Design a protein around this ligand. Sequence first.
Ligand SMILES: *[C@@H]1O[C@H](CO)[C@@H](O[C@@H]2O[C@H](CO)[C@@H](O)[C@H](O)[C@H]2NC(C)=O)[C@H](O)[C@H]1NC(C)=O
Ligand SMILES: *[C@@H]1O[C@H](CO)[C@@H](O[C@@H]2O[C@H](CO)[C@@H](O)[C@H](O)[C@H]2NC(C)=O)[C@H](O)[C@H]1NC(C)=O
Ligand SMILES: *[C@@H]1O[C@H](CO)[C@@H](O[C@@H]2O[C@H](CO)[C@@H](O)[C@H](O)[C@H]2NC(C)=O)[C@H](O)[C@H]1NC(C)=O
Ligand SMILES: *[C@@H]1O[C@H](CO)[C@@H](O[C@@H]2O[C@H](CO)[C@@H](O)[C@H](O)[C@H]2NC(C)=O)[C@H](O)[C@H]1NC(C)=O
Ligand SMILES: *[C@@H]1O[C@H](CO)[C@@H](O[C@@H]2O[C@H](CO)[C@@H](O)[C@H](O)[C@H]2NC(C)=O)[C@H](O)[C@H]1NC(C)=O
Ligand SMILES: *[C@@H]1O[C@H](CO)[C@@H](O[C@@H]2O[C@H](CO)[C@@H](O)[C@H](O)[C@H]2NC(C)=O)[C@H](O)[C@H]1NC(C)=O
Ligand SMILES: *[C@@H]1O[C@H](CO)[C@@H](O[C@@H]2O[C@H](CO)[C@@H](O)[C@H](O)[C@H]2NC(C)=O)[C@H](O)[C@H]1NC(C)=O
Ligand SMILES: *[C@@H]1O[C@H](CO)[C@@H](O)[C@H](O)[C@H]1NC(C)=O
Ligand SMILES: *[C@@H]1O[C@H](CO)[C@@H](O)[C@H](O)[C@H]1NC(C)=O
Lengths: 50, 269, 197, 205
Amino acid sequence: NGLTGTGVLTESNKKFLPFQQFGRDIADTTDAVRDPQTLEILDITPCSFG
Amino acid sequence: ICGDSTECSNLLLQYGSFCTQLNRALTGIAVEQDKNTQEVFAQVKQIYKTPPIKDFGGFNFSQILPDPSKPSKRSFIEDLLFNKVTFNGLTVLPPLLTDEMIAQYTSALLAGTITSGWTFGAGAALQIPFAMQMAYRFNGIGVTQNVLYENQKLIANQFNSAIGKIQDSLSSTASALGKLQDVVNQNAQALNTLVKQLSSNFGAISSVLNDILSRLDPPEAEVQIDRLITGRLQSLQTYVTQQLIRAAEIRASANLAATKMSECVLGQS
Amino acid sequence: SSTASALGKLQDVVNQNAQALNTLVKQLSSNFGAISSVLNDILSRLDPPEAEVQIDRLITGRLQSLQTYVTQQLIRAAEIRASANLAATKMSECVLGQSKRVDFCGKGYHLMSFPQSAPHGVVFLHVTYVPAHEKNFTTAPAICHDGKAHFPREGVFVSNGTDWFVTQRNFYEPQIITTDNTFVSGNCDVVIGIVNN
Amino acid sequence: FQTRAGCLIGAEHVNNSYECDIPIGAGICASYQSIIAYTMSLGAENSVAYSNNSIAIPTNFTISVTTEILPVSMTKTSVDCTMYICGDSTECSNLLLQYGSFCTQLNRALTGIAVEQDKNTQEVFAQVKQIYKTPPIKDFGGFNFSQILPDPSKPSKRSFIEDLLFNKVTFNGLTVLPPLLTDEMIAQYTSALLAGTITSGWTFG
Ligand SMILES: *[C@@H]1O[C@H](CO)[C@@H](O[C@@H]2O[C@H](CO)[C@@H](O)[C@H](O)[C@H]2NC(C)=O)[C@H](O)[C@H]1NC(C)=O
Ligand SMILES: *[C@@H]1O[C@H](CO)[C@@H](O[C@@H]2O[C@H](CO)[C@@H](O)[C@H](O)[C@H]2NC(C)=O)[C@H](O)[C@H]1NC(C)=O
Ligand SMILES: *[C@@H]1O[C@H](CO)[C@@H](O[C@@H]2O[C@H](CO)[C@@H](O)[C@H](O)[C@H]2NC(C)=O)[C@H](O)[C@H]1NC(C)=O
Ligand SMILES: *[C@@H]1O[C@H](CO)[C@@H](O[C@@H]2O[C@H](CO)[C@@H](O)[C@H](O)[C@H]2NC(C)=O)[C@H](O)[C@H]1NC(C)=O
Ligand SMILES: *[C@@H]1O[C@H](CO)[C@@H](O[C@@H]2O[C@H](CO)[C@@H](O)[C@H](O)[C@H]2NC(C)=O)[C@H](O)[C@H]1NC(C)=O
Ligand SMILES: *[C@@H]1O[C@H](CO)[C@@H](O[C@@H]2O[C@H](CO)[C@@H](O)[C@H](O)[C@H]2NC(C)=O)[C@H](O)[C@H]1NC(C)=O
Ligand SMILES: *[C@@H]1O[C@H](CO)[C@@H](O[C@@H]2O[C@H](CO)[C@@H](O)[C@H](O)[C@H]2NC(C)=O)[C@H](O)[C@H]1NC(C)=O
Ligand SMILES: *[C@@H]1O[C@H](CO)[C@@H](O)[C@H](O)[C@H]1NC(C)=O
Ligand SMILES: *[C@@H]1O[C@H](CO)[C@@H](O)[C@H](O)[C@H]1NC(C)=O
């Protein structure tokens, strides 16, 4: 939905409420989104590095 | 600074070799920490062991000797101390020496000083009955050794009472280990502000670089990315300098601790 | 003479200084965001209004580089000063006198020391005394005689199996027990370990 | 192999325990034979024979001599602003003029550092008031200081050990200033100290 990012998508059990669209954890990092066509609570996780 | 962007990396390329210096400084800090631990704790070669039978002239060291029941073989006081006190491009590296090895060094040192006296700090450990060692220490401070051999029972009794009292005081009053907690809090706060600084415009149109890439024409995207780059680089430099100062102070403290262990544990000062 | 790499501290101090100076001089060849890293070419290509902007970019970048170099030099100087203070204290204590603080200079009972110069430091030769060839004996804390307790003036009681002896603590040297090297304090009915002799 | 530090490819895990050559982390490290990774061994294991009526007394002794190296000084350097950042350009200097007095602080810091180095050397070495000289005839109860006393034959007036040490170890607006005290003077201080401690003991302190 216009928000671009690279990571791995995992099904999340976070309990959103019918007016949020995307959550975050801390320091302004989009941590979970809701897909427009299914209304599903996903989970963004950065790809492995080190 | 860049977060895996080709354009940002290319722009940062023409800013000289700052990052090699920063990484070198941080690696030096890490190696220095490892050396501090090694030189403050690794002071003996043989790993001495206490005898199975414990008759130390009436003294009772059970509170301090390792307990085989627990897996870590940590003493009661060590367990109390341990219980008392609690990605975006940053990593934490594990220490070289694990906690069990440190506990093993402490146990070896304590067994050596509890059986052989101070002799094990110079050559090879030579056994000595504990009462005779205490008599030697009284002779050292300026009291004839008659006093110990005539008041051994009372001396042992009040020694045990004192050790129990310090155990109880440590257990009850939580506010006992302030310095370590202060160090941990300072480090955590520095990391927190460093990671929070990433959410600033620095005069640009947005605080996120991906939107700038995906929204705007390169020719002025260089300008916006330059603003972001200079701000983040300045913040990183400040953080590195603060870390260097704190590490130097910690090194001074570690040197003092090593001297204290060498002078007061291995001998009577 | 044979084994090398025994003077790592002075060598890598020199290497640190040389590396810092080398990277400082290298830093002079970066654009820092401007159109070129050579001054005159920027000067003799453009008119002043943006030539001055490019000059400002060069000036500021070189300024932070120099500032960083100075700060690093200050930190290193503080560390070296601490080391020099330690060296001065060691020279004062372990060269001009015999030290008693254990493990301050050398491992073992310290005897004396010698200084030697170095390109940017000092080398101490510590002479220490280390015992060896130990023997295991039976001991006792006091001696009962006439109902009185005797303690050694300075030494310790040992026995090779028979007849008992007094000796100094750090070197085997038995001597027959006499009233001259022992002193009396009370009757022997309270000490834990008295032996009849 | 999988370790608390991550993953390791190219070495063979073993169940022995030797000293630590190349530290890796979490108490384990590797070495060469092939390359093998193992757990650190803290050292030898022994149990001193404690009893309540037994002691150990030495019967002989040894005399040991050990080294200890300590740096005391570093090179004195100075840097000029206008020569460095401007490179003899009038317009560059004019532009720099309005940036405040940073360069005065920089030069002040460098000068302070150099003075500190000189003070460090002087306070470390100049511990004596008179230069003592050993007598030409040397009969020190059987002890032999030939390798340590200065050799007048050499032009440098340095001992064998000092020569070994000295041989073993190896512009754009920046300058290096010479130290105040030359090498010969430092050697003279060392010789004075050493003769004083040989002959007078600790009394000369
Ligand atoms: C040394 O101290 C420990 C603990 O203070 C003693 O262990 C106690 O022993 C008594 C008698 O068996 C028990 O009632 C306590 O519960 C024990 N305490 C703990 C914490 O377990 C030990 O007995 C002392 N040593 C000697 C020789 O008396
Ligand atoms: C302990 O040392 C004493 C002191 O030398 C020994 O006593 C002497 O032993 C020799 C060897 O048999 C005899 O020739 C002497 O006559 C003994 N001296 C006296 C005064 O009797 C003693 O034998 C040693 N004991 C042990 C077990 O080593
Ligand atoms: C040194 O330890 C031994 C054994 O631990 C003690 O020997 C005991 O002595 C008492 C006193 O007569 C006897 O009742 C015991 O039977 C002995 N035990 C053994 C195993 O023989 C000896 O008393 C201790 N010496 C001291 C503390 O000076
Ligand atoms: C040391 O000698 C004294 C005196 O010769 C011994 O004391 C005697 O002990 C016996 C046995 O307990 C008693 O029957 C006597 O009445 C004691 N006499 C006196 C004067 O006290 C003592 O037992 C000896 N100690 C040892 C370890 O042999
Ligand atoms: C020290 O005295 C002991 C007395 O038993 C001598 O024997 C040693 O005893 C300990 C205690 O069990 C053993 O662990 C050692 O293995 C024994 N030694 C030997 C050689 O078997 C011992 O010889 C004496 N000397 C030393 C240096 O320990
Ligand atoms: C103390 O140790 C020294 C050094 O090992 C011994 O001196 C050696 O003695 C042997 C046998 O007499 C000689 O072969 C060596 O040449 C001696 N070495 C030196 C450097 O002199 C000495 O004998 C030992 N003393 C005792 C009492 O054990
Ligand atoms: C002190 O030690 C030096 C070590 O070099 C001795 O000098 C050597 O002496 C031997 C025996 O006379 C000669 O063969 C060597 O050629 C000498 N070496 C040098 C470099 O001169 C010196 O003799 C010793 N002093 C005493 C009094 O024994
Ligand atoms: C969007 O249309 C597709 C096509 O049938 C359908 O599967 C999906 O459920 C629709 N989603 C919404 C939110 O209407
Ligand atoms: C080492 O010991 C473990 C058991 O702790 C065993 O499973 C393993 O096969 C042994 N050998 C190696 C090479 O790990």
